[PDB]
Structure 1
Amino acid sequence: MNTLELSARVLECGAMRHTPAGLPALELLLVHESEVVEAGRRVELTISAVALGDLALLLADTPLGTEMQVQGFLAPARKDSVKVKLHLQQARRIAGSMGR
């Protein structure tokens, strides 16, 4: 079991990159702000995220500030790192009807 579901806004969206094996790869910087319940609290969390393959292609050029629901697994950012990165398995924009 390793699944993080997070509501987040796009702070940064990288240019299209690739894995050493030639698969599309895209890095995003995400910010989450919410109030949660702990022992009967607000949280602000900044987190790096990476999408590979088709999802990287879909998330290409996501405007900055876009609000999203995402899901994936957590992993250390680099070998031996304290920094974690969210490996995206799902991402959807919070579509609205304003929208002006």
Structure 2
Amino acid sequence: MNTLELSARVLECGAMRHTPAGLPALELLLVHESEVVEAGHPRRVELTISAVALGDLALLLADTPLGTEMQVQGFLAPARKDSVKVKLHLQQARRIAG
């Protein structure tokens, strides 16, 4: 089990790249903001996380306007081998239109 669901705004949207096998790959920077209750107390949560799309989601998310609201889900992986930093690997994403 490894699945993160998150609502966020696109803070940065990289240039479209491709793997050697020609697969589209895109890196984005997402910023999440919300209030949550912890142990029975209110708490502001502001999370910035790097996310990677590969394949069809990369094509879908390519050139997303900055500030765009999104709803994504995917799995967490270390940024780099043995890294304590984490990156979200997108499996689902949808661009919300205000």
2:82 counterpart SS class: coil
Q: Aligned runs of 1:47-58 on 2, under 5 Å?
A: 47-58=49-60
**Structure 1 position 70, deviation (Å):** 0.6
Q: Aligned runs of 1:19-38 on 2, under 5 Å?
A: 19-38=19-38
**Structure 1 position 83, deviation (Å):** 1.4
2:59 counterpart SS class: helix
Q: Which 10-residue stretch deviates more, 74-83 or 17-26?
A: 17-26
**Structure 1 position 20, deviation (Å):** 4.2
**Structure 1 position 67, deviation (Å):** 0.6
CA distance in 1, matches of 2:44, 2:20: 39
Give the percent of matched residue pairs that are identical in Structure 1 and Structure 2.
100
The aligned residue for residue 94 of structure 2 is: 92
- 1:36-95 CA-partner distances (Å, limit 9, x unpaired): 111111111000000000110111100000011110000001112121100001111122
For structure 2, the residue ranges without an aligned partner over 5 or more in a row are none
TM-score (norm 2): 0.91
Q: Aligned runs of 1:1-100 on 2, under 5 Å?
A: 1-40=1-40, 41-95=43-97
**Structure 1 position 22, deviation (Å):** 2.9
Q: Which 10-residue stretch deviates more, 56-65 or 74-83?
A: 74-83
2:22 counterpart SS class: coil
- Decide whether aligned partners of structure 1 residues 82 and 20 sit closer, same or farther in structure 2, where only a CA change above 3 A counts: farther
Root-mean-square deviation (CA), in Å? Answer: 1.0
| Larger strand percent | 2
TM-score (norm 1): 0.90
CA distance in 2, matches of 1:90, 1:43: 22
